[PDB]
Amino acid sequence: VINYVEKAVNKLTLQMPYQLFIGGEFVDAEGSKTYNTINPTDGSVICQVSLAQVSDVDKAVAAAKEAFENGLWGKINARDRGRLLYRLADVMEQHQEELATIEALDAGAVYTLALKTHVGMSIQTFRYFAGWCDKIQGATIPINQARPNRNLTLTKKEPVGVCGIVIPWNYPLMMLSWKTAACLAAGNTVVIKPAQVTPLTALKFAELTLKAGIPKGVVNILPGSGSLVGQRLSDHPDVRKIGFTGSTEVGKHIMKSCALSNVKKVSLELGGKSPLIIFADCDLNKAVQMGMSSVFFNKGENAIAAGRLFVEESIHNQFVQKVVEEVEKMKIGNPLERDTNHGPQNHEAHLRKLVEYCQRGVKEGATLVCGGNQVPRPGFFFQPTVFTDVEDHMYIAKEESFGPIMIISRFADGDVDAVLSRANATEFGLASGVFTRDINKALYVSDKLQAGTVFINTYNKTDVAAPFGGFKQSGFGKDLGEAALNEYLRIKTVTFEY
Amino acid sequence: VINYVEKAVNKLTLQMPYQLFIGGEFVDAEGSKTYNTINPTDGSVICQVSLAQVSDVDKAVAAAKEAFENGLWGKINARDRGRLLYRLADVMEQHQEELATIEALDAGAVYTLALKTHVGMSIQTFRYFAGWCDKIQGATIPINQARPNRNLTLTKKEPVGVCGIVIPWNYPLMMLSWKTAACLAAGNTVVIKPAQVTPLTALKFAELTLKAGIPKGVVNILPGSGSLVGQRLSDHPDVRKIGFTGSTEVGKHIMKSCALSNVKKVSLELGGKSPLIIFADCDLNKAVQMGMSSVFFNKGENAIAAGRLFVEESIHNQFVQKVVEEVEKMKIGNPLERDTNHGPQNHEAHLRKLVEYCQRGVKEGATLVCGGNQVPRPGFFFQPTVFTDVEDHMYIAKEESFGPIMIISRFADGDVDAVLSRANATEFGLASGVFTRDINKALYVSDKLQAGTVFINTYNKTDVAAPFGGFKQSGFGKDLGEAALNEYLRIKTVTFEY
Amino acid sequence: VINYVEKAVNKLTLQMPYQLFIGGEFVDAEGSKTYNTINPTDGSVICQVSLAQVSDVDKAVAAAKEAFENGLWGKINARDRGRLLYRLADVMEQHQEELATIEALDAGAVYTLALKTHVGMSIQTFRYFAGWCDKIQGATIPINQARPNRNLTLTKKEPVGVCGIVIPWNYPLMMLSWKTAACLAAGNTVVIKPAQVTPLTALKFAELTLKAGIPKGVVNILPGSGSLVGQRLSDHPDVRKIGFTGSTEVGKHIMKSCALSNVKKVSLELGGKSPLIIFADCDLNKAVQMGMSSVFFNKGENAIAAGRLFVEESIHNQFVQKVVEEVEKMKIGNPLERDTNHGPQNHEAHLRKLVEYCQRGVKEGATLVCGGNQVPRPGFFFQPTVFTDVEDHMYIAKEESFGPIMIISRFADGDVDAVLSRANATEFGLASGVFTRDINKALYVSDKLQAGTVFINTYNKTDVAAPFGGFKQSGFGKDLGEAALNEYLRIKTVTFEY
Amino acid sequence: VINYVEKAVNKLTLQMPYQLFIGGEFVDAEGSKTYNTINPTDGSVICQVSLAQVSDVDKAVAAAKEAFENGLWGKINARDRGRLLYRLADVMEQHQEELATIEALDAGAVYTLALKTHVGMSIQTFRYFAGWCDKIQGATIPINQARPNRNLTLTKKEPVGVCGIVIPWNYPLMMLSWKTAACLAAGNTVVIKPAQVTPLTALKFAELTLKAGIPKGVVNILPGSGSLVGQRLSDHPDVRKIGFTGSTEVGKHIMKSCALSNVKKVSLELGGKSPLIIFADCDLNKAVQMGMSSVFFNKGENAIAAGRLFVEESIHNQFVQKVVEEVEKMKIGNPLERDTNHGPQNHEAHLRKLVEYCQRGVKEGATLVCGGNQVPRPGFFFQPTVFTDVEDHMYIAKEESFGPIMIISRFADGDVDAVLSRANATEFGLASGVFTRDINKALYVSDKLQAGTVFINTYNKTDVAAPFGGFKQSGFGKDLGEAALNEYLRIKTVTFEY
Incomplete structure (x- = not known):
């Protein structure tokens, strides 16, 4: 026995x-x-x-x-x-x-x-x-x-x-x-x-x-x-x-x-430090839904989470307003409660690393839009976080959080190859993605992206x-x-x- | 220009x-x-x-x-x-x-x-x-x-x-x-x-x-x-x-x-230290030709050269006698001359190395049936050598020579599993081969040999x-x-x- | 319902x-x-x-x-x-x-x-x-x-x-x-x-x-x-x-x-009219059992059954002597009874054709060694049959029986392409077999056979x-x-x- | 010699x-x-x-x-x-x-x-x-x-x-x-x-x-x-x-x-009678080029010629007018003249069948926009041709012409499944095409087309x-x-x- x-x-x-x-x-x-x-x-x-x-x-x-x-x-x-x-x-x-x-x-x-x-x-x-x-x-x-x-x-x-x-x-x-x-x-x-x-x-x-x-x-x-x-x-x-x-x-x-x-x-x-490029001509509500998930899924403890979202200039602010509307609705709670959306980090030391991480993001100049902190309740919960105004030299642009932290950058209207290298600049290449409704863009973007997985108009879609x-x-x-x-x-x- | x-x-x-x-x-x-x-x-x-x-x-x-x-x-x-x-x-x-x-x-x-x-x-x-x-x-x-x-x-x-x-x-x-x-x-x-x-x-x-x-x-x-x-x-x-x-x-x-x-x-x-297993039921003349080649091809500077020959009791002696007979016939000499069938070794250091190698085989107890030395002419030429009475524990049974040194052991009439095991007793695994006319031993031995290539009734046949x-x-x-x-x-x- | x-x-x-x-x-x-x-x-x-x-x-x-x-x-x-x-x-x-x-x-x-x-x-x-x-x-x-x-x-x-x-x-x-x-x-x-x-x-x-x-x-x-x-x-x-x-x-x-x-x-x-070629160097007892099965399995009603067995002169007479002893130990009976090993033919019409088929086998000159008739009992049973002395031009050497009829031809000791030729002289070409301990014969024979499947030292081994x-x-x-x-x-x- | x-x-x-x-x-x-x-x-x-x-x-x-x-x-x-x-x-x-x-x-x-x-x-x-x-x-x-x-x-x-x-x-x-x-x-x-x-x-x-x-x-x-x-x-x-x-x-x-x-x-x-479905959100001018080629390439003598163009209602007339503009520029004549665009039909009897086919299109009510005739000159030229107002039951909506004949049908805006039925309501199924900037229709229309080749934003691109x-x-x-x-x-x- x-x-x-x-x-x-x-x-x-x-x-x-x-x-x-x-x-x-x-x-x-x-x-x-x-x-x-x-x-x-x-x-x-x-x-x-x-x-x-x-x-x-x-x-x-x-x-x-x-x-x-x-x-x-x-x-x-x-x-x-x-x-x-x-x-x-x-x-x-x-x-x-x-x-x-x-x-x-x-x-x-x-x-x-x-x-x-x-x-x-x-x-x-x-x-x-x-x-x-x-x-x-x-x-x-x-x-x-x-x-x-x-x-x-x-x-x-x-x-x-x-x-x-x-x-x-x-x-x-x-x-x-x-x-x-x-x-x-x-x-x-x-x-x-x-x-x-x-x-x-x-x-x-x-x-x-x-x-x-x-x-x-x-x-x-x-x-x-x-x-x-x-x-x-x-x-x-x-x-x-x-x-x-x-x-x-x-x-x-x-x-x-x-x-x-x-x-x-x-x-x-x-x-990895997986890039997700989001053009103006995508379907924007769906880009919000799938964008959020690309970060928050399984409390961000996900080797292929989007580690950097590049959002096209003209839809950036509208994208951020909409992500903030939806983050306020996620229900943080015990993993066994059926209505829970967002559960604890895995162990204590990782929660510490997450805190130090967003501390440093604020220090170096990025704009903290929500979250960033331990949730005040017992265990090791962490608030779903959103940074904007991330510039390519910042530590939060280079480093893997492994946590629920959305790191957003702007790029210029119609400016494909430039955003491409920004996205390729990393020494990781585990995954990537792109949202657009234009086929040419999507096909071209998937050739140039230097990652083992390219997701097109979806994300975290393993099989x-x-x-x-x-x-x-x-x-x-x-x-x-x-x-x-x-x-x-x-x-x-x-x-x-x- | x-x-x-x-x-x-x-x-x-x-x-x-x-x-x-x-x-x-x-x-x-x-x-x-x-x-x-x-x-x-x-x-x-x-x-x-x-x-x-x-x-x-x-x-x-x-x-x-x-x-x-x-x-x-x-x-x-x-x-x-x-x-x-x-x-x-x-x-x-x-x-x-x-x-x-x-x-x-x-x-x-x-x-x-x-x-x-x-x-x-x-x-x-x-x-x-x-x-x-x-x-x-x-x-x-x-x-x-x-x-x-x-x-x-x-x-x-x-x-x-x-x-x-x-x-x-x-x-x-x-x-x-x-x-x-x-x-x-x-x-x-x-x-x-x-x-x-x-x-x-x-x-x-x-x-x-x-x-x-x-x-x-x-x-x-x-x-x-x-x-x-x-x-x-x-x-x-x-x-x-x-x-x-x-x-x-x-x-x-x-x-x-x-x-x-x-x-x-x-x-x-x-x-590697590639084993070649020769059974009493192979075509024996063909086995001398292919056996010799399995060693001497390209003056032995060959990564899949047969490192050890295991030859069945009943034919061990007639097999050796015939190899010796055929070695006498090789014209060693200038690689540019049409007659030549055996070039010099690649370089000086590898020649001195083959000399130490065969002394070492003698000191440890193996019979030196022929060759062993530098050919007394200009350049860096080595004698096609043959060892017999080679025991599983000897240095020359374990180490890769990279030269024209056929290294022969016996095995018991009938004794299939036993020989496989001695042939598999190396941490090398590059190549191997078996000679026999028996379809059953050929398929079985090829399963059991632990090597990247298995040659059955031929050797050195890369493509x-x-x-x-x-x-x-x-x-x-x-x-x-x-x-x-x-x-x-x-x-x-x-x-x-x- | x-x-x-x-x-x-x-x-x-x-x-x-x-x-x-x-x-x-x-x-x-x-x-x-x-x-x-x-x-x-x-x-x-x-x-x-x-x-x-x-x-x-x-x-x-x-x-x-x-x-x-x-x-x-x-x-x-x-x-x-x-x-x-x-x-x-x-x-x-x-x-x-x-x-x-x-x-x-x-x-x-x-x-x-x-x-x-x-x-x-x-x-x-x-x-x-x-x-x-x-x-x-x-x-x-x-x-x-x-x-x-x-x-x-x-x-x-x-x-x-x-x-x-x-x-x-x-x-x-x-x-x-x-x-x-x-x-x-x-x-x-x-x-x-x-x-x-x-x-x-x-x-x-x-x-x-x-x-x-x-x-x-x-x-x-x-x-x-x-x-x-x-x-x-x-x-x-x-x-x-x-x-x-x-x-x-x-x-x-x-x-x-x-x-x-x-x-x-x-x-x-x-x-199919599948030729099974049995060499003298084969394992004669296995050759007989696998030979039996090659024709008798599922009372011969089997698109892949050996419809000609070619046997090497030196062992032909000894092969037929053995096949016959075995045919004789076959229990015939109700498919539901544990110790039955040869059940009835599928249906009357087919049974009738089997009768006609051995009639012509005999008419045209072949020696009928045993069987070739409806077993006297009710339903549609048929007697395990063996013909020897089958010449290439005969009906029973060309037409598929799809019954339990072993049809045997001699070939001259050591004559490979000659029998290959005879084995291929049909417009069928669905399966075939060769029994032999000679890897060389076996591999050459399987190249040369004009058939969908070639078995080597086995038969009816679908997967x-x-x-x-x-x-x-x-x-x-x-x-x-x-x-x-x-x-x-x-x-x-x-x-x-x- | x-x-x-x-x-x-x-x-x-x-x-x-x-x-x-x-x-x-x-x-x-x-x-x-x-x-x-x-x-x-x-x-x-x-x-x-x-x-x-x-x-x-x-x-x-x-x-x-x-x-x-x-x-x-x-x-x-x-x-x-x-x-x-x-x-x-x-x-x-x-x-x-x-x-x-x-x-x-x-x-x-x-x-x-x-x-x-x-x-x-x-x-x-x-x-x-x-x-x-x-x-x-x-x-x-x-x-x-x-x-x-x-x-x-x-x-x-x-x-x-x-x-x-x-x-x-x-x-x-x-x-x-x-x-x-x-x-x-x-x-x-x-x-x-x-x-x-x-x-x-x-x-x-x-x-x-x-x-x-x-x-x-x-x-x-x-x-x-x-x-x-x-x-x-x-x-x-x-x-x-x-x-x-x-x-x-x-x-x-x-x-x-x-x-x-x-x-x-x-x-x-x-x-074939392969359909090419052109959506209003395509590049209009590339569509008129690739569209013309899709029919006129090699004088229409082409198994994968687009046998129907389905043009989305809103861009049809602009499309037909541009196509007429370009058909008048095509240069007709001797295959050896280096500036020829369109050569003779392959032989008389086929020329004659092209003639009858076009009569029949007009007879059954389609609109002849240009051409539909033997070009008057020696040998067997035929005018590049455009038909409009083609309806799903017509003969020229069903029969392969093998000539240089553009056969166009409109289809209602923002239907997709309903244009696929029309494009699939033939018993031919050799090729097909879709022009569209929208990835979602492209991928979906490619699945749905019952043809062995689907071109997407191109045509006749075999390899x-x-x-x-x-x-x-x-x-x-x-x-x-x-x-x-x-x-x-x-x-x-x-x-x-x-």
Whole structure:
């Protein structure tokens, strides 16, 4: 039997695992060490969670290696790996209310959105990839013939083997799902590190894999310190790939560590400063609605949020009046209250960073139109904010808030290429967008924008079939889509002579 | 007008550029510095070659950058880019004897082999990749629809931008062309660092890009020091991809610097210790021919040369006897002479290295059945060598020689799984092969071998359409085939709502 | 409520629909016309079944058209259409014991096989294709830019629309599943025509689509005379694709009909005379079992069965001696009994042709080693048959039997192209096989065989991922695999200038 | 030596073969039968051309079948096949002035346009398809494993064999180039039947294949009666694929014949009546330019000609007036005059049909704004024509004219779905267009149009990489694009057990 932290909320009896998941069992960390996970709604401790040690990482991994090399996962039909992954998806759906509640407690996700998206997309993610398992194909290739002889050349797609994935705290389960589904669809086994601040949906997902019959060893979760577990996953000789989403500096270190050990393959999503250009000839109310969302969605803790809105001169003031009208209507509150629109930031230290951030924006000269402060109520809520008169040299033009702060700039009537470089000046390139009703503009603007995603007349419109990843200092590699699969596959060439 | 080093050799008149190619002109390095390049057939100094300085690397990068962003190459149709690359290939052909002659002098490549393979394949590459330009396609993806609205999602494959590629010395022009043709075809610009010890066909090549009409600044070439130029390209914040083939420790470092600067994408080809497994049921005469070749091809300076031969008990002795018989017959000598089937080694330091290498095999217990020493003639020639009684723990069973040293162990009659396991006991994984007439062992062994390429009843049969790359510590990324392009393209997702 | 035929048998209580399925409701045919369906184990009348007339064909088409054009199926996400098909597969799984049993009474399929294979594969078929729904992608293409402007070119894969599929009687549910599942996955709607002699499992399937939530009109089934429904569907101006499996004469007329109406798309799969070539170096006992199965599986009623076995002189006599011993251990009997392994032929008329066929086999000079006659018992059973001494010019060497008739020819030891030649001297070309331990023989033999599928050391090894169709007069077009989707999709090219 | 018709014209001495081209040699038809080919600039006989008889067809097929089965074309590497086809484009380039004059003579194509587009695009198509040869690739597929044994499934893509292709007269060289290039690229051989009224460029083409090194018998050409040649090819037992482009009645008959003989494969491109919908928010003047071209290009002799312009009510009259302004500026005359805009129709009988068509438009109530007549001068000119007040039931609203006839209908402001019905109420569906500055209608009208090509803010912008073909009664199959290659290839699934 599994030890749970029981807790009655949202009409529910939650049963939450709080330990390391290694080898298909929940165990305490070495020397029973633990740490506190914190509910951002009121500041309380939710419980104590195991704190992984170097020798626990070694066990997660030995188990991942054994499951891959000798266990069932590596011996069964691609189609059957499909079945299992599609079953895990049914289980996740059977437990959806419970997972969205846990994600609301653990991470401050407004409960309606945690159902429809955090958990909703998690489920689509496994179901999509399960589809791929028996549809991953190699090639036969018509090479030159060694006459008087004959040659056949074919390629076999194979799994890379044991993989370490490190997940961010903005959407704990969904991001777990994005990287894990693809990784396992390709026939790998995995050691997962959820962020230190958000371990709970990972741990419950762990248990679901048991409920789903996924073979002992295939999934191993290690909550705890990022630089203890992330570091060792990178150095380890039996790990062949690291998937990393997170901060830039930590990214660089990770790739560096991958290089120094065994030249493991590495993915990196290091956030962004995504531009959104809004011309005069767009549909303005809709630009307001979608503009607001491009910033405020999931309390701005969103690696592709619009980090700079460039609004055409002649509609700028009208756009700002309208955004202010609508911001006053958002309902800030507890994530479990059904009428809540805008919930807490994820943890305390981020709320501090948000405060410091808008302090500095005011200092350096920008115009603060609303918000900027902690909301006066318990927990870690932050007021939806709007800056105008942002000039390209300001820190709030260069830096990623990861919070609900709308940073607006003007550009001149009909002045396309100039606004284009302003928008391209960054060393990020994770996403971008443009609103206009003119087709020429839209097409042209999407060619020139130096970002991995261009949204046209919509925003935050990701999908499990559509690949996701940045250019430049946002990193490289994709999550979601056929393309995702390639990070977790290796290609073998086989050339016969006969 | 271009300065040349003129030489009457091989019934032609080589006219060799010897300088830096930067932005369309041959120029001297900073401070007019130069180094000598040496002819391995006689020990003499072919000529003086510019020695590239940090400020030159930067000038080469700035010109690659201008050409990508504001040059014609970035404006022209994909079809016309293809045209230009087919032209280049025609020019290369028109100069085939000169290029193979240059390569004979600079690298010691036997002229016939050079003409057929080094240059032949080179020309095939540019031809192959030429036809890819206007067939590089993206996708349209049926995403869930934001009803009542509609969504179109598509992808654009786009060039990554300024690239830097670092070429080894074993097939100077060929290796250059494997990497450049793919890079160029995807629409990038390039800065190429050929090995210090082999700069010559790379500068001739550069002159040819001029004959071909490749716009100024698309190709730039920088002979010089490996660390000086490699390190600078790795750090430069305008470079976005490194392609690298070379030694383990250098590669790791390259990958490190890529991480610590701007998360530039990277590729690593790091050689191997490739196992070749020979079963008593193969055609034995053919196995001696192909087996010998698997080692001695291009005097062993070959990244997928067979590092270890495992030969079945029942035929081990008859197999050795026959190899020895056939080695006696090889004419070693001047690469320019028609009779010659074995050139000198590339350079002096690699020859001394092969000498230490075989002493070391003897000290540790392996039988030295022939060769082992420098051939007593001018230049840097090495004896085709054969070792037997080689135990799994020996240094020469683990380390990559890069020379003509066939290294043979036995295995037990019947013992399939056992041998696979010893063949897989390396942290290399570049290539492998199996000889046998049995369909069942061939398919099974090819599954179980842990390497990027598996040759079945042939060896060294690469082709411009078949992807080439390692697993484990041989690195990652592919040269050749369609897969090679994915290394030099990026995917932008455009998602419209309407 | 639905009118059933109830039947207690095999320890279940069968509930079998028996009417036209049209617009999601079972209805009687024009003027209440009916015909009888005969149990082949005993010749009795299972029941009356509706007899579709012309006005019914139009009603079914008119329903499919409305459901494609205005109903949910043409409006939902590709992703969700996936879910409906995975759901249909789970419903078929839930009624699996019952479907196997209807297939036993209706088609004389041995129960244990009907369950593992007819039903089994049918489930995989819907699971596999449900997978494709949202992995069906078009392209983005790099056309020449109309300077000084820009062009964008993409392709959208769209459904074809209303399809008619005509299903054979050999594996009724399975072959329905084959063509239906791909058709639906691509977003089409369908009118299905099962074989006059095997309507039952189709009609029960029609009911299960109700349980799965498939919108009304998407599936429609019309039992009846093949030549009336078949005729009308292929004439109808609102049907845009016929998928057909059946005989040459009928297939031909159908294609002719598609042309004279509205130039509908067609696929044709017209049977086979598949050569199996058995080499002396093969594993003789496996060769015998796989040989047995190659002819006897599903009492030979199988478009891909080995209709000639060529055996190498040195092992011919020993092969026949063994085949005969095995033929003799075959238990013949009621498909419902656990220990039966050779059930009755599908229907009387077919049984009669099998009789006529061996009459001519004997008349024309072939040695009849065993069987070749109706088993004396009731219903329609036929005796496992083996002919040896078959000469190329003979009727039984040219015409497909589609019964359990093994037809053997010698070929001279070591004569490969000569037998290849004989194996290819047919206007069929649907499948083939070679048994041999020689990789070289195996690979060469598979190049040279003029056939849609080549098996190597196995036979009847179809898989839902592996495309299935013939060359020459056996047809064109694939079932199964990614290739299947192509027969049911159109490609639209969109070219913008901007 | 070949027999020429020598003509000094357009500063050149043309050398025009006039014989049948069978097996690499030009020859008279059976009993030397000939027919004349008429210059439509002045109605003069150009010269007499051989007239293919049945025996002749058979000879050509046999020469193709021999070349495919046993000749060089069949044994070479796909890469070497690529090369020859590239050489073929080069020879055509060197002859490009000559071919364009020949086409100006035989087809009345304006010389400037024959050079740039008729011949230019031909040159492109060969170049395009040459690149595809060594890049046509099969699959390796993850099927379920027959445990404890193992399985390998792969697909080989192979040629179909002898093809027959029937070429229309409107762009004789170009159309021939379209089908022949992909056909040859895929590995097959061919009998090409040019239009009876336009043999000359096809025959000049055949000479060129000689110069190019195409093996004797890969390309066979048979000028003469359409019924005689095309009908024989369709029934021939040794032909395996027909590619047909022309008229609906002849197309239907062709498909029928493929069915009746051996179920050979068939493509049909059967013309269009393609709608071009112009919205009031377009650029008015670009619309009048692109609009005029959409109809008048190549004298209206164009399968994707805009057969109806639907102009939004509010901009109609301004549009019709501007169009009249511009039609009066078009210069009419000799195809060799370098300032000609509009040349003669292709032949008398078509001129005569243009005349009748226009009478009929007026008779049924449409408004003749200009033209609708033979231009009085020698040869077969027809006036550029504008019709207005066209209504949905009229004959000229339904029938394809294939002449230079603008047929305009108004449509009510701010309806969109209602103009789509009108644009879709034809049984043609080859092409279509939308002019609009508004992205939302553009993307939506592109989905909704039932045609194989949608131009958006441009027209007639085909391209060798972009697939061309029809839906509904326009036929099926593609020319141009990767997807054309699959009309000419078959797939072999090969399945191992081991």
